[PDB]
Amino acid sequence: MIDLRSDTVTKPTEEMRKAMAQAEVGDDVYGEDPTINELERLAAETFGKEAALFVPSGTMGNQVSIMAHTQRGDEVILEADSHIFWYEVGAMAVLSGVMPHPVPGKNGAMDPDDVRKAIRPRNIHFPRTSLIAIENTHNRSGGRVVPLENIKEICTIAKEHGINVHIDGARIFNASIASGVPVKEYAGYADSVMFCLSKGLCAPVGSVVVGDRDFIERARKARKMLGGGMRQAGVLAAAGIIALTKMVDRLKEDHENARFLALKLKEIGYSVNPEDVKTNMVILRTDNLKVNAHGFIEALRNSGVLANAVSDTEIRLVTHKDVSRNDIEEALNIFEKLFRKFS
Amino acid sequence: MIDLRSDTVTKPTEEMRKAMAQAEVGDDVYGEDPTINELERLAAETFGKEAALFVPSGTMGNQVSIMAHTQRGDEVILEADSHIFWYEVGAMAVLSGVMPHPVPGKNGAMDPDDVRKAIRPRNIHFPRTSLIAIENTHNRSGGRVVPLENIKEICTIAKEHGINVHIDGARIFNASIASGVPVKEYAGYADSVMFCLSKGLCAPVGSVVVGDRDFIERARKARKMLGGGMRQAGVLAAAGIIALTKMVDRLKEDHENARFLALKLKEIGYSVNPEDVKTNMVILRTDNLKVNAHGFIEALRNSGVLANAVSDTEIRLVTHKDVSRNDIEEALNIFEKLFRKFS
Amino acid sequence: MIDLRSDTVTKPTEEMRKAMAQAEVGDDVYGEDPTINELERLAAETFGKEAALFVPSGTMGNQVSIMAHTQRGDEVILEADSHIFWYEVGAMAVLSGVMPHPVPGKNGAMDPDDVRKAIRPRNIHFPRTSLIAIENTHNRSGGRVVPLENIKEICTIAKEHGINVHIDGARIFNASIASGVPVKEYAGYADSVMFCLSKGLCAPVGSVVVGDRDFIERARKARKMLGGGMRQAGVLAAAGIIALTKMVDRLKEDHENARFLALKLKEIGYSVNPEDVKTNMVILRTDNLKVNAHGFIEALRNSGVLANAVSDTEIRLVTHKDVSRNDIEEALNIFEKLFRKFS
Amino acid sequence: HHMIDLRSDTVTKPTEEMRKAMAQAEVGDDVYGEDPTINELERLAAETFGKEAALFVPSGTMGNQVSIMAHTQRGDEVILEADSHIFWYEVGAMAVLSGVMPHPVPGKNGAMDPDDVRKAIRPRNIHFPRTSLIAIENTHNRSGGRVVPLENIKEICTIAKEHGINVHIDGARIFNASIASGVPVKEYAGYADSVMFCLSKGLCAPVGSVVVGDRDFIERARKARKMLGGGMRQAGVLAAAGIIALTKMVDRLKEDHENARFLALKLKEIGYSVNPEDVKTNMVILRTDNLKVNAHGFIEALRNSGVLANAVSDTEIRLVTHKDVSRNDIEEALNIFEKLFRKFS
Ligand SMILES: [Ca+2]
Ligand SMILES: [Ca+2]
Ligand SMILES: [Cl-]
Ligand SMILES: [Cl-]
Ligand SMILES: [Cl-]
Ligand SMILES: [Cl-]
Ligand SMILES: [Cl-]
Ligand SMILES: [Cl-]
Ligand SMILES: [Cl-]
Ligand SMILES: [Cl-]
Ligand SMILES: [Cl-]
Ligand SMILES: [Cl-]
Ligand code: NA
């Protein structure tokens, strides 16, 4: 099967499988896993931050960041189509007792003036705005790159008000590859960044949160509370090091395959916009087709293509390491045949 | 001072004060205060509900309702400019562990189709939508009346999905006076209603929640936890009975004073919409003025008029029993003079 | 009915009823109720503290104090039979995200060495101990007075660890009338104290939290969140001033009545300990009777005497202004008939 | 390398067999329920405990906390033993995450008197939280790995049934209990709604634990796991090791028991305050009451002579045996304990 559902389905490379077998391990509860310790040291250095914390998931990364940044009844400004709001189970409410303050954005880019206006005045009736979250790349909009200038402007606003800044940088390396902006440079405008090892960088498990020592110390106690305090997790960290240090550059190939796929899908007759394709995601609309997104997902699966429907009329196609250029070509031959059928 | 900040500043009538001194009381924790019991019975009867619960504040009313309607990790659909989101201290997050889902509206009226789209599908990544809140009158937009048809339609959608509906009817008798829709009719389209006694109806303290007996039982236990479990509160209920049964018709005097104020403010040259004024509120914009809202609020204070800024460019003027037509005329002389200064 | 259930059932004096009706009020949200402001100023003065906050209940008192003293995940040391653990609906967990750390005491008095041992070391696994609560008088033991020297030593321990101290002083004036220790001496060894107006001091509604300015400001925003931010609450504070300033001395009568009640009960043959009775409560054991605590409560009620069982073998009798000596003597005649029946 | 580590059974390292299995693991995206190695671990765990459904988690702390969440509403009370791990060593999570209050009940070596549990249940009254969960820990860590009898658990189950209260067993070391008692883990679990057990302690997996229970409960716990951040991707890597832990590493817990008993009996002969009669699984409590140092001073003296151990109070030390401490290591440590006894005695 050709799996275009998500970059989450990436499997470990042979180099990672080997590194996991030979991993040097220890009890991370005591700070004694040498591989964890090295991955964290590396993550911290790559983002120009004092400290780093490995977590079993990006959700946990964001949720411990929120905890470490907030007090009960605080408010978090985030983009209205962001993952923290949509896809993290209302955890910020339950775990941290904080309210989201959604601001609309153009492809993840909140207008700095709208962020300015979402910030609470000091008044008894109002929660305290203590955190602003920015997502790069932006997922719901189709893997779009927030301009560095937006992040720089929003950062400045936050300094003026003493408000912390988090980048949900689940796909920050995809952002860096597309934009040319080094991740240290995005990171410098943030108090904390969460990034995933387990999507396009192909590690089997986990993400990392980078930040200041005192922030990470708090986040590490948050992690213990939430159940992220693992033992000999250096098995996972071994894959994690290879993800971080060796698997970034080739993300360029995911973007090329995605753009190649979109252009060719448009030639066939599918309703796609290749000019919208900036990273590893292609949005496919089904309005011109005889079945909706859900029916077309089934027709694709029967022909050996996996994809998800994100609404009744939209499918998302996501490239990653485990879909090669050949697989893209194979998929296109299938998409051609299914156009003769469902157009 | 001519106090246009809010209708909360209403002081008790002479009859209220007499009834409070003479109040037949008991220990409400044992259900033994007869005057609370009677107020409750009356409020439930007037809204066409099984039961009612006295609370010390409208905020407590809304929050015990949220608690009684929801579980930890649920989502609450509400209007993007509603009081529960803006002026209730992030309590829904702290107290109930729930996420707000702000939907934009037109003067408090959320488009039913947007309410339908805000409902979370059943998926592991998603909170459960268990509550839709509707505010009538809608404060932020200028004490606007939400049309009945809007409330009926949203109620129809909630029924279809098994979602509770709550009305924040802090000023529901104002709505009813302007609209001619009885409060029993509004309430038939909701599972619960909070209404205030301490604003336009002139009681010194508190509000009531009305709904089913099992819901009210849950809300009564919540009230206990939150600290609204009082003792001989029949003192307060005695005024609240007078507020409910004697102070509703004269709200129309407040509507008239507000409209008159608006009409005269427009003729001076201020940025007001007298056609939008149908209850006890006027939104004044500072966009044609030399100072912003906060500068203009200081100037009014300095000449003897109290009002609140609701943004950097908008001021809310609220009428009530303690501002007479003479007071409004006196305030118009002052506004006239400050228009010379700041236009 | 002779009501020995609790001191909560106290009803307002004529003087209080007149003061409520003649109360000078304003909007407490704006800090403009002059009678609330005077009550607060007086409560602060009396406790030798810089600031005070009126609340609708003592439960809200304790809970806003916990909120203002704590962060999510902290731990609060309290006596194992204290009202905060037993009678406040699990609120500290819900509202503040904090764990109770029960320590056994001897009549409310926790052994300081045990308090020392319950303080958590700094360890990722451990919540931070940020608060120690002491209840005086201690209710479940029979209105027992905690020694000043106990509070003094626990205070010293707290200062070594940087831990806050809250006295649940619901009945601190009973303590003070019994011991001769002024409430400002108890409170000089604490950061905050909550005391009740609505129990033995006879106000219809409310309690007060005293403490430092910063702490009270936090407790005031917490109160807003919980729904205790009332409007023209001067009606209640009028009676509150009379309670604080005029109803304290006469608590000695309640104590004399409780003592007479215990001596006479013992002389009839009931299992009471008059040597334990130093305030307004008597614990009576049902061990020499043919019924348990609950069956005796029923027998009593059918003969016109109201009390509460606190276990299967114990009833608590409570004196207050609305059980006079005649009432105690009438009650004793009934208790004598029932001892013939049940002994 | 090259200290004798008696601090805990958490410190166990994977076997060669486990390392090969992880590296070679068949994986998928567990968010989709498509990791076949995870799926098989859960199938096997559920079956081993006589339950419909199982859920892999990254920590026992997560196992417990998703169980509490799945069992409770905000404001509820959880009855548990006063020295239980959920209370002491889980960072206040039950309060923050579930908004519930612990109701501590003192136990006798892990075992709460049934009637004490019954009196801890709240009546229906406005002032009281709802008692919705009773938690039982087996083995009980803090009393020295003590085995809660099956009959205690049976009786508590019966009380709970009568009041409609859920029962969670924190069986972090439930196979240790099972090996000592001869009671199959399915029997312990038959008197419980849910059980959490660790794979990463004495069973030697590098990461994780499992929750077992009914289908509808496990579905609720799976959504809580997603909320807390335990929803992983290609976790079959970890579950490869866990299948080996569950299927090959249970019987040899007998050796850890043998080692702890030997250790305690020999420590008793030397003259240390230990109770060999209390040692039935993999732990020894040693008191410092007849020594010139407290627990902390003794831990440092041990560290200085090549032995790692943890103070559990100012006067007590807990020695824990596990796969990476051999009989020979125990003998070495005893020879040192003997010298140190002369020093501090
Ligand atoms: Ca077509
Ligand atoms: Ca591959
Ligand atoms: Cl190793
Ligand atoms: Cl906090
Ligand atoms: Cl009366
Ligand atoms: Cl209108
Ligand atoms: Cl007045
Ligand atoms: Cl820590
Ligand atoms: Cl005493
Ligand atoms: Cl595979
Ligand atoms: Cl809940
Ligand atoms: Cl045992
Ligand atoms: Na010693």
PDB file of C-alpha atoms in Angstrom, chain B residues 3 5-6 8-12 17-18 20-27 30 32 56-60 63 67 83 87-91 94-96 198-199 202-206 221 224-236 306 308 316, chain C residues 3 5-6 8-12 14 17-18 20-27 30 32 56-60 63 67 83 87-91 94-96 198-199 202-206 221 224-233 235-236 306 308 316:
ATOM      1  CA  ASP B   3     -23.926  56.510  36.961  1.00  0.00           C
ATOM      2  CA  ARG B   5     -21.594  52.275  34.099  1.00  0.00           C
ATOM      3  CA  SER B   6     -24.120  49.478  34.555  1.00  0.00           C
ATOM      4  CA  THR B   8     -25.722  46.555  38.644  1.00  0.00           C
ATOM      5  CA  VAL B   9     -25.460  49.824  40.598  1.00  0.00           C
ATOM      6  CA  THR B  10     -29.237  49.731  41.267  1.00  0.00           C
ATOM      7  CA  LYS B  11     -29.917  50.162  44.993  1.00  0.00           C
ATOM      8  CA  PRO B  12     -32.815  48.511  46.821  1.00  0.00           C
ATOM      9  CA  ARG B  17     -35.466  47.296  52.593  1.00  0.00           C
ATOM     10  CA  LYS B  18     -38.602  46.736  54.650  1.00  0.00           C
ATOM     11  CA  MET B  20     -35.338  42.421  54.153  1.00  0.00           C
ATOM     12  CA  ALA B  21     -35.688  43.540  57.819  1.00  0.00           C
ATOM     13  CA  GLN B  22     -38.901  41.497  58.148  1.00  0.00           C
ATOM     14  CA  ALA B  23     -37.595  38.441  56.244  1.00  0.00           C
ATOM     15  CA  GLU B  24     -38.712  35.014  57.473  1.00  0.00           C
ATOM     16  CA  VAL B  25     -35.446  33.038  57.448  1.00  0.00           C
ATOM     17  CA  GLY B  26     -33.906  29.617  58.074  1.00  0.00           C
ATOM     18  CA  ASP B  27     -30.772  27.627  57.264  1.00  0.00           C
ATOM     19  CA  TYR B  30     -30.924  22.355  55.381  1.00  0.00           C
ATOM     20  CA  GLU B  32     -35.145  25.463  55.718  1.00  0.00           C
ATOM     21  CA  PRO B  56     -25.049  35.010  45.094  1.00  0.00           C
ATOM     22  CA  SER B  57     -24.019  36.079  41.533  1.00  0.00           C
ATOM     23  CA  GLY B  58     -24.846  35.578  37.883  1.00  0.00           C
ATOM     24  CA  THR B  59     -21.336  34.298  37.352  1.00  0.00           C
ATOM     25  CA  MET B  60     -22.030  31.590  39.917  1.00  0.00           C
ATOM     26  CA  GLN B  63     -20.725  28.293  36.261  1.00  0.00           C
ATOM     27  CA  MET B  67     -20.698  22.167  35.875  1.00  0.00           C
ATOM     28  CA  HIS B  83     -19.888  37.229  29.030  1.00  0.00           C
ATOM     29  CA  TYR B  87     -16.068  38.465  31.984  1.00  0.00           C
ATOM     30  CA  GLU B  88     -16.186  35.270  34.052  1.00  0.00           C
ATOM     31  CA  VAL B  89     -12.453  34.919  34.883  1.00  0.00           C
ATOM     32  CA  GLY B  90     -11.731  31.753  32.821  1.00  0.00           C
ATOM     33  CA  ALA B  91     -13.873  29.894  35.413  1.00  0.00           C
ATOM     34  CA  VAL B  94     -10.765  25.990  36.123  1.00  0.00           C
ATOM     35  CA  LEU B  95     -14.063  24.800  37.589  1.00  0.00           C
ATOM     36  CA  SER B  96     -15.417  22.440  34.902  1.00  0.00           C
ATOM     37  CA  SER B 198     -29.284  42.423  41.075  1.00  0.00           C
ATOM     38  CA  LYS B 199     -29.192  44.454  37.885  1.00  0.00           C
ATOM     39  CA  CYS B 202     -32.961  46.280  41.683  1.00  0.00           C
ATOM     40  CA  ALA B 203     -32.309  43.502  44.244  1.00  0.00           C
ATOM     41  CA  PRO B 204     -28.974  44.077  46.082  1.00  0.00           C
ATOM     42  CA  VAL B 205     -27.678  40.481  45.630  1.00  0.00           C
ATOM     43  CA  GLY B 206     -27.920  37.483  43.440  1.00  0.00           C
ATOM     44  CA  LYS B 221     -24.129  20.569  44.950  1.00  0.00           C
ATOM     45  CA  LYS B 224     -21.916  24.148  47.707  1.00  0.00           C
ATOM     46  CA  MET B 225     -18.437  23.369  46.374  1.00  0.00           C
ATOM     47  CA  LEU B 226     -18.022  26.823  44.937  1.00  0.00           C
ATOM     48  CA  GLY B 227     -19.049  28.447  48.236  1.00  0.00           C
ATOM     49  CA  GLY B 228     -22.563  29.741  47.371  1.00  0.00           C
ATOM     50  CA  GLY B 229     -24.136  27.635  50.161  1.00  0.00           C
ATOM     51  CA  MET B 230     -25.400  30.347  52.460  1.00  0.00           C
ATOM     52  CA  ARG B 231     -27.429  30.214  55.662  1.00  0.00           C
ATOM     53  CA  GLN B 232     -30.246  32.680  56.436  1.00  0.00           C
ATOM     54  CA  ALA B 233     -30.232  34.089  52.863  1.00  0.00           C
ATOM     55  CA  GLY B 234     -34.011  34.697  53.027  1.00  0.00           C
ATOM     56  CA  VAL B 235     -32.976  38.276  53.830  1.00  0.00           C
ATOM     57  CA  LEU B 236     -31.729  38.541  50.214  1.00  0.00           C
ATOM     58  CA  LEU B 306     -19.628  57.378  35.078  1.00  0.00           C
ATOM     59  CA  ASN B 308     -17.124  51.974  31.205  1.00  0.00           C
ATOM     60  CA  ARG B 316     -21.108  51.283  27.111  1.00  0.00           C
TER      61      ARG B 316
ATOM     62  CA  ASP C   3     -32.314  23.032  67.750  1.00  0.00           C
ATOM     63  CA  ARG C   5     -27.892  20.702  65.405  1.00  0.00           C
ATOM     64  CA  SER C   6     -25.459  23.538  64.884  1.00  0.00           C
ATOM     65  CA  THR C   8     -25.472  27.839  61.753  1.00  0.00           C
ATOM     66  CA  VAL C   9     -29.198  28.076  62.605  1.00  0.00           C
ATOM     67  CA  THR C  10     -28.759  31.345  64.481  1.00  0.00           C
ATOM     68  CA  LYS C  11     -31.213  33.960  63.250  1.00  0.00           C
ATOM     69  CA  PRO C  12     -30.587  37.732  63.145  1.00  0.00           C
ATOM     70  CA  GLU C  14     -33.667  42.856  65.972  1.00  0.00           C
ATOM     71  CA  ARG C  17     -32.615  43.430  61.111  1.00  0.00           C
ATOM     72  CA  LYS C  18     -32.873  47.210  61.494  1.00  0.00           C
ATOM     73  CA  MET C  20     -29.843  45.569  57.207  1.00  0.00           C
ATOM     74  CA  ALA C  21     -32.861  47.615  56.210  1.00  0.00           C
ATOM     75  CA  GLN C  22     -30.980  50.922  56.884  1.00  0.00           C
ATOM     76  CA  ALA C  23     -27.716  49.682  55.231  1.00  0.00           C
ATOM     77  CA  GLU C  24     -25.653  52.075  53.088  1.00  0.00           C
ATOM     78  CA  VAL C  25     -24.755  50.174  49.967  1.00  0.00           C
ATOM     79  CA  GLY C  26     -22.876  50.388  46.739  1.00  0.00           C
ATOM     80  CA  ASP C  27     -21.469  48.088  44.093  1.00  0.00           C
ATOM     81  CA  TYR C  30     -16.250  48.449  42.011  1.00  0.00           C
ATOM     82  CA  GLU C  32     -17.924  50.934  46.396  1.00  0.00           C
ATOM     83  CA  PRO C  56     -20.844  34.422  51.053  1.00  0.00           C
ATOM     84  CA  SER C  57     -19.659  31.369  52.984  1.00  0.00           C
ATOM     85  CA  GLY C  58     -16.807  29.993  55.012  1.00  0.00           C
ATOM     86  CA  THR C  59     -16.333  27.222  52.472  1.00  0.00           C
ATOM     87  CA  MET C  60     -15.583  30.051  49.935  1.00  0.00           C
ATOM     88  CA  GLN C  63     -11.261  27.751  49.160  1.00  0.00           C
ATOM     89  CA  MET C  67      -6.366  29.161  45.636  1.00  0.00           C
ATOM     90  CA  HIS C  83     -13.786  20.521  57.768  1.00  0.00           C
ATOM     91  CA  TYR C  87     -17.244  19.011  54.535  1.00  0.00           C
ATOM     92  CA  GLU C  88     -16.188  21.126  51.603  1.00  0.00           C
ATOM     93  CA  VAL C  89     -17.267  18.814  48.732  1.00  0.00           C
ATOM     94  CA  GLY C  90     -13.760  17.926  47.528  1.00  0.00           C
ATOM     95  CA  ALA C  91     -13.373  21.508  46.326  1.00  0.00           C
ATOM     96  CA  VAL C  94     -11.405  20.665  41.788  1.00  0.00           C
ATOM     97  CA  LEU C  95     -10.758  24.334  42.211  1.00  0.00           C
ATOM     98  CA  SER C  96      -7.039  24.471  43.071  1.00  0.00           C
ATOM     99  CA  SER C 198     -23.034  33.291  60.240  1.00  0.00           C
ATOM    100  CA  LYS C 199     -22.587  30.767  63.049  1.00  0.00           C
ATOM    101  CA  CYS C 202     -25.561  35.426  64.410  1.00  0.00           C
ATOM    102  CA  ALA C 203     -25.245  37.184  61.047  1.00  0.00           C
ATOM    103  CA  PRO C 204     -27.554  35.672  58.433  1.00  0.00           C
ATOM    104  CA  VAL C 205     -24.888  35.336  55.789  1.00  0.00           C
ATOM    105  CA  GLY C 206     -21.161  35.203  55.391  1.00  0.00           C
ATOM    106  CA  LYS C 221     -10.032  37.515  42.013  1.00  0.00           C
ATOM    107  CA  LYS C 224     -14.852  36.557  41.404  1.00  0.00           C
ATOM    108  CA  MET C 225     -14.149  33.265  39.626  1.00  0.00           C
ATOM    109  CA  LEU C 226     -16.086  31.220  42.153  1.00  0.00           C
ATOM    110  CA  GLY C 227     -19.124  33.585  41.918  1.00  0.00           C
ATOM    111  CA  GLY C 228     -18.873  35.338  45.320  1.00  0.00           C
ATOM    112  CA  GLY C 229     -18.463  38.761  43.725  1.00  0.00           C
ATOM    113  CA  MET C 230     -21.751  40.307  44.847  1.00  0.00           C
ATOM    114  CA  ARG C 231     -23.253  43.741  44.284  1.00  0.00           C
ATOM    115  CA  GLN C 232     -24.935  45.723  47.094  1.00  0.00           C
ATOM    116  CA  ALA C 233     -23.790  43.252  49.740  1.00  0.00           C
ATOM    117  CA  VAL C 235     -27.119  44.751  53.469  1.00  0.00           C
ATOM    118  CA  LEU C 236     -25.236  41.596  54.675  1.00  0.00           C
ATOM    119  CA  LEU C 306     -32.874  18.441  66.802  1.00  0.00           C
ATOM    120  CA  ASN C 308     -26.770  15.605  64.162  1.00  0.00           C
ATOM    121  CA  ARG C 316     -22.832  16.387  68.516  1.00  0.00           C
TER     122      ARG C 316
END
